[PDB]
Design a protein around this ligand. Structure first.
Ligand SMILES: *[C@@H]1O[C@H](CO[C@@H]2O[C@@H](C)[C@@H](O)[C@@H](O)[C@@H]2O)[C@@H](O[C@@H]2O[C@H](CO)[C@@H](O[C@@H]3O[C@H](CO[C@H]4O[C@H](CO)[C@@H](O)[C@H](O)[C@@H]4O)[C@@H](O)[C@H](O[C@H]4O[C@H](CO)[C@@H](O)[C@H](O)[C@@H]4O)[C@@H]3O)[C@H](O)[C@H]2NC(C)=O)[C@H](O)[C@H]1NC(C)=O
Ligand SMILES: *[C@@H]1O[C@H](CO[C@@H]2O[C@@H](C)[C@@H](O)[C@@H](O)[C@@H]2O)[C@@H](O[C@@H]2O[C@H](CO)[C@@H](O[C@@H]3O[C@H](CO)[C@@H](O)[C@H](O)[C@@H]3O)[C@H](O)[C@H]2NC(C)=O)[C@H](O)[C@H]1NC(C)=O
Ligand SMILES: *[C@@H]1O[C@H](CO[C@@H]2O[C@@H](C)[C@@H](O)[C@@H](O)[C@@H]2O)[C@@H](O[C@@H]2O[C@H](CO)[C@@H](O)[C@H](O)[C@H]2NC(C)=O)[C@H](O)[C@H]1NC(C)=O
Ligand SMILES: *[C@@H]1O[C@H](CO)[C@@H](O)[C@H](O[C@@H]2O[C@@H](C)[C@@H](O)[C@@H](O)[C@@H]2O)[C@H]1NC(C)=O
Ligand SMILES: *[C@@H]1O[C@H](CO)[C@@H](O)[C@H](O)[C@H]1NC(C)=O
Ligand SMILES: *[C@@H]1O[C@H](CO)[C@@H](O)[C@H](O)[C@H]1NC(C)=O
Ligand SMILES: [Ca+2]
Ligand SMILES: [Ca+2]
Ligand SMILES: [Ca+2]
Ligand SMILES: [Ca+2]
Ligand SMILES: [Ca+2]
Ligand SMILES: [Ca+2]
Ligand SMILES: [Ca+2]
Ligand SMILES: [Ca+2]
Ligand SMILES: [Ca+2]
Ligand SMILES: [Ca+2]
Ligand SMILES: [Ca+2]
Ligand SMILES: [Ca+2]
Ligand SMILES: [Ca+2]
Ligand SMILES: [Ca+2]
Ligand SMILES: [Ca+2]
Ligand SMILES: [Ca+2]
Ligand SMILES: [Ca+2]
Ligand SMILES: [Ca+2]
Ligand code: NA
Ligand code: NA
Lengths: 428, 428
């Protein structure tokens, strides 16, 4: 005869499932000498989960019944057990089937306690990252049901089911990440089943935010006015530029250089340190040639898709008194630097020489005072700016002196003052 | 007296500019013997540009007058020089100012003929790149006025003016660039002034498009279904994955790996080649333990801000006949494998043995044929699936023989078939 029974797993050893006397009365009481029958179980002596009492026919749990090690994740679980009546003469055969129900004696569990995941700050709102699945060997209501993520402002989870039915958690970036502000997170993922009592397991996700090159260098200020004495030595520090980049590694490492469009002249006279940004002089400047310079400097990081920053540096040169006045004396005489005077006297206010002075410099450094200091009484008459005339101031005397020596002094209004002197003689 | 004249540069040497005798008549005609006066130029510097005719006072070009070498880029240009009348008796002084005008005898020119510029395809519509400025030593309308860029579909040009008045060209990205399609451009930039005849100069732009990581790997298919014999040797090639990335260098170098969320079990049994994508078996499979696998494999490039690609590989394991049938024979005898039989003549169909068979496999590989072989007159009667009884089939006349030896055959319906044999003796 066939008998079917229904138990819960892990019940205490020795508990009775059924009593043959009570359930197979129709068979036992119809044998010869009903009270003399004895029972024998048909199993091996290794791990007998069900046992029969040979004297009264009690079917009781012999060893622990773990549904999980027995049927794994199958919904249907049942143990088979054959019992026979002794003696052999007209023995009966009882095939006993015990359906095993599952209790919730297993909590959700994670493979690893630390779940390291790396996310680039570039990751767009909506990015999804499947997380480790917890394992719950139970079945039905007792198996893994849902997940939950510790409260925070940047991540969520959606619970999903894959092809085979199992459930898993998908991490979702819901707010724009920024490594420059918060580089790492630590959040708790909790899996829980739907059993009674409800069980839970948990793991910690260590989210690390990798840097992307979402920031370019920045200058303190964009414009600069530098004054430079035209006599500064090669190597003078014109300006130490400082730019900053919040990014990490190469993305935040800055290189300074002259903008790609700078004129060659600027590169001829100035040099910029690629690493520290020391704008230095390479060959001296001359106010008498170019009075100003408009340098365009750029700073760019060594990261990908890099946008550069730029600042403008105006170098204004200032004049120094590095040019001495020039004296030119011109005469009517076609040949030489000598002024010919009539042997026998001459009239007053007679043209002797034209005098022109000039100074390369500017301002007071280029303004000239001219003085005539010959050994006599000639007069230096102004005609226009920096152009004077040399004339006489009284009637001369041939007999007294024949050779004259005149000296012109040109002295600019600079400090230190500079001056030159020229000499020429008057033959009469 | 002051005299002002207006001439053009580069005029034919020897041409007459003005006649002093004619222009200072109002002064000469008030002298004694106006017709005897002669003129002398006060030519200063090592620059003999203009000459005076001593007899009539004609001002003629002594040497070529190049406005560019004299006043450079200044609007106001003039040569100043003093001329005097002979004889000295009340000689006159004429200050002459000769304004030199500019002709368009110089074309715009570029410092370098090839202008190499590098642009990353990531550069957004609107990016601007100031380009080298050409230099035109002319002045006014004759100097650099406008620029022009060879016709194209990806770049535009805007003309600009800097603080000091000079003009420059700003390159503009007008349409989204894509290096994967077109890696370089070559465009002609022409600077032209506004003189008549209009003169022009040109340089060529070598535009290089640097690659950015704007593409992630791609798989041929999204999922793959693999059937796998549970007896395949370690190393069987399950699948050769091919992913492609159009990017350059590291951006296009692909790495294959198991997704970070795969279970340790999957990594215990499978291996993926990081470089070529060879999904191979690491530890043999057993259909009797796990029947399928859902592998999540990813391929990502070695570039920045990299998004990985994903493919799902479903491995269906298939049963083979790799388990032999198992026989359990149970008897009355508690000690050893001999079944003690009633010495006295027994009736037909008397219990001798209980026999159970089983097979781990599935389908025909798990279907068992059970057969009873022996000396004679025994019957193997089925009770239920894979469970039979050994009984007697004739009157046990002890006289014939006392010892019997019986052999039980379990042979599954697999291919190749597997079998188990049991032996036990029947004493009467
Ligand atoms: C992934 O890419 C794999 C590579 O295939 C190429 O990839 C790139 C580089 C391009 O060239 C592209 O055009 C190619 O597709 C690809 O695997 C290939 O698959 C084919 C069949 O699908 C294979 O052809 C078969 O080759 C074997 C062996 O020959 C090879 O191996 C020997 C030993 O190493 C070498 O000496 C040879 O030079 C070959 O390289 C043959 O035995 C076989 O012949 C039999 O099968 C064909 C039909 O396939 C019949 O017509 C014949 O009559 C025979 O019955 C084929 O010739 C090819 O070998 C293989 N190459 C690999 C793996 O490198 C794969 O399909 C792509 N996708 C996936 C999902 O795997
Ligand atoms: C760029 O930065 C440098 C360095 O400044 C220092 O380092 C940076 C990384 C930042 O952390 C700064 O906050 C930090 O101060 C600047 O150079 C520094 O300039 C100052 C003056 O501005 C120097 O100190 C002065 O030196 C004079 C002359 O001897 C004294 O009379 C003053 O009493 C005062 O001490 C300082 O020495 C100098 N640093 C070094 C290392 O030489 C630099 O100015 C700056 N660039 C710009 C454009 O501001
Ligand atoms: C899993 O169990 C179902 C449920 O039915 C069974 O009912 C009892 C008879 C007993 O067997 C209990 O353990 C189960 O709860 C099975 O469904 C039956 O399957 C048989 C044949 O397989 C079929 O003839 C019946 O009609 C089915 N019953 C119903 C209500 O539809 C199912 O077969 C079991 N699956 C496996 C793989 O064993
Ligand atoms: C030029 O001639 C005039 C004629 O009157 C003189 O006055 C200048 O000399 C100065 O003036 C007189 C009044 C006297 O005080 C004399 O001592 C002055 O030096 C004369 N100048 C020169 C430089 O010879
Ligand atoms: C230069 O010439 C202009 C005419 O274009 C005139 O207006 C100006 O006065 C001149 N520059 C001077 C006088 O400094
Ligand atoms: C057992 O003996 C009977 C007697 O006729 C016979 O019919 C039967 O075939 C025998 N058993 C087997 C398995 O042949
Ligand atoms: Ca259990
Ligand atoms: Ca359980
Ligand atoms: Ca559970
Ligand atoms: Ca950021
Ligand atoms: Ca940066
Ligand atoms: Ca960053
Ligand atoms: Ca100088
Ligand atoms: Ca100077
Ligand atoms: Ca001076
Ligand atoms: Ca010229
Ligand atoms: Ca010119
Ligand atoms: Ca020109
Ligand atoms: Ca592209
Ligand atoms: Ca690209
Ligand atoms: Ca790529
Ligand atoms: Ca197997
Ligand atoms: Ca098998
Ligand atoms: Ca088998
Ligand atoms: Na610096
Ligand atoms: Na491959």
């Amino acid at each position: 005869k066939n008998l079917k029974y229904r138990i819960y797993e892990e019940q205490r050893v020795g508990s009775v499932i059924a009593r043959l006397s009570e359930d197979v009365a129709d068979v036992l009481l119809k044998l010869p000498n009903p009270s003399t029958v004895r029972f024998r179980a048909m199993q091996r002596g290794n791990s007998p989960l069900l046992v029969v009492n040979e004297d009264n026919g009690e079917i009781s749990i012999g060893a622990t019944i773990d549904r999980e090690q027995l049927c794994q994740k199958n919904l249907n679980c049942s143990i088979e057990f054959d019992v026979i009546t002794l003696p052999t003469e007209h023995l009966q055969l009882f095939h006993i089937e015990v359906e095993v129900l599952d209790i919730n004696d297993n909590s959700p569990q994670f493979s690893r306690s630390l779940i390291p995941i790396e996310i680039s700050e570039s990751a767009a709102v909506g990015t999804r990252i499947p997380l480790d699945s917890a394992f719950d060997p139970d079945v039905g209501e007792n198996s893994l049901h849902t997940y939950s993520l510790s409260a925070n402002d940047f991540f969520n989870i959606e619970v999903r089911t894959r092809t085979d039915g199992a459930k898993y958690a998908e991490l979702i970036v819901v707010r724009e990440l920024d490594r420059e502000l918060k580089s790492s997170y630590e959040l708790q993922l909790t899996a829980s089943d739907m059993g009674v009592p409800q069980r839970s397991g948990s793991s910690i996700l260590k989210i690390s935010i990798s840097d992307s090159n979402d920031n370019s260098p920045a200058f303190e200020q964009q414009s600069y006015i530098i004054q430079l004495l035209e006599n500064s030595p090669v190597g003078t520090l014109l300006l130490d530029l400082n730019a900053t980049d919040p990014d990490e590694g190469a993305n935040g490492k800055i290189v300074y250089s002259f903008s790609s469009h700078v004129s060659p002249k600027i590169m001829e006279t100035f040099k910029i340190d690629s690493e520290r940004g020391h704008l230095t002089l390479f060959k001296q400047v001359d106010y008498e040639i170019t009075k100003s310079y408009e340098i365009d400097v750029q700073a760019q990081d060594l990261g990908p898709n890099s946008i550069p920053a730029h600042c403008k540096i105006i170098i204004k040169v200032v004049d120094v008194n590095d040019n001495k006045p020039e004296i030119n004396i011109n005469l009517m005489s076609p040949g030489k630097e000598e002024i010919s005077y009539i042997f026998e006297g001459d009239p007053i206010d007679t043209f002797v020489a034209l005098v022109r002075v000039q100074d390369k410099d500017s301002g007071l450094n280029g303004e000239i005072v001219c003085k005539l200091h010959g050994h006599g009484h000639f007069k230096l008459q102004k005609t226009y700016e920096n152009n004077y005339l040399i004339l006489t101031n009284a009637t001369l005397d041939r007999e007294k002196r024949s050779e004259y020596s005149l000296t012109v002094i040109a002295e600019d209004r600079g400090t230190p003052s500079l001056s030159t002197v020229k000499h020429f003689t008057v033959q009469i």
